[PDB]
Design a protein around this ligand. Structure first.
Ligand SMILES: *[C@@H]1O[C@H](CO)[C@@H](O)[C@H](O)[C@H]1NC(C)=O
Lengths: 54, 170
């Protein structure tokens, strides 16, 4: 994409009733909002179209 | 059991209205009848096996691989080892379950054939003998109305008992 520098994105999982801590002074891509899983579903893969009436 | 493709020489392509049927002859003619119980008890079994295998499972499994952004190689040769060995198992049971439920299906036709044959062999009692191709040689008179009494199992053995014991020994 015209850029040679990179951004390697990490992640962890914060349990309910706990915290996270960052100490830094550089090369940081900050988070604004953290996801919260809603419940149960399923992901798949396909390379075709969908149908809804079946 | 020897019935189908044993001592009966063959089956009857005209018997639309059953798996099993009757076919007689007398001073009137020849007619192809059918037998409901013997046909129906066999239908109960072919579709019983059917209602089993339709029972599916309530255990769900997730997509664990990836064919877009591929996973690691040392693990692919282990998942493609477990999956390609589960493939080899259900390809063994479908090799064995399908091979057996068919093996067990034709024999339910030779035991439903020795069960209709050794019964008419008991209503007639001591009034007929068996020739060779699978028939009962009647040596007395039995017409269209008499045959239908052996069909619905109301034939009485002491009703024609003295005639056939006089035309069989002579
Ligand atoms: C969370 O932590 C607080 C204090 O640490 C405690 O009073 C509370 O019972 C915990 N659980 C929930 C569900 O808030």
């Amino acid at each position: 994409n015209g850029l040679s520098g990179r951004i390697d994105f990490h992640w962890l999982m914060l349990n309910p009733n706990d915290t996270v801590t960052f100490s830094f002074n550089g090369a940081f891509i900050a988070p604004d909002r953290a996801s919260f899983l809603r419940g149960k579903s399923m992901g798949i893969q396909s390379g075709v179209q969908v149908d809804a009436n079946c | 059991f020897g019935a189908i493709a044993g001592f009966i020489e063959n089956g009857w392509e005209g018997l639309i209205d059953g798996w099993y049927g009757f076919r007689h002859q007398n001073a009137q003619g020849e007619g192809t009848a059918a037998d409901y119980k013997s046909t129906q008890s066999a239908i109960d079994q072919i579709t019983g096996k059917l209602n089993r295998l339709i029972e599916k499972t309530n255990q769900q499994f997730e997509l664990i691989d990836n064919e877009f952004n591929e996973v690691e190689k040392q693990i692919g040769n282990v998942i493609n080892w477990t999956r390609d060995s589960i493939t080899e198992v259900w390809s063994y049971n479908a090799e064995l379950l399908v091979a057996m439920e068919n093996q067990h299906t034709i024999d339910l036709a030779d035991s439903e054939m020795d069960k209709l044959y050794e019964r008419v062999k008991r209503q007639l009692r001591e009034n007929a003998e068996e020739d060779g191709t699978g028939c009962f040689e009647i040596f007395h008179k039995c017409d269209d109305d008499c045959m239908a009494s052996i069909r619905n199992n109301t034939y009485d053995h002491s009703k024609y008992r003295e005639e056939a014991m006089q035309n069989r020994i002579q």
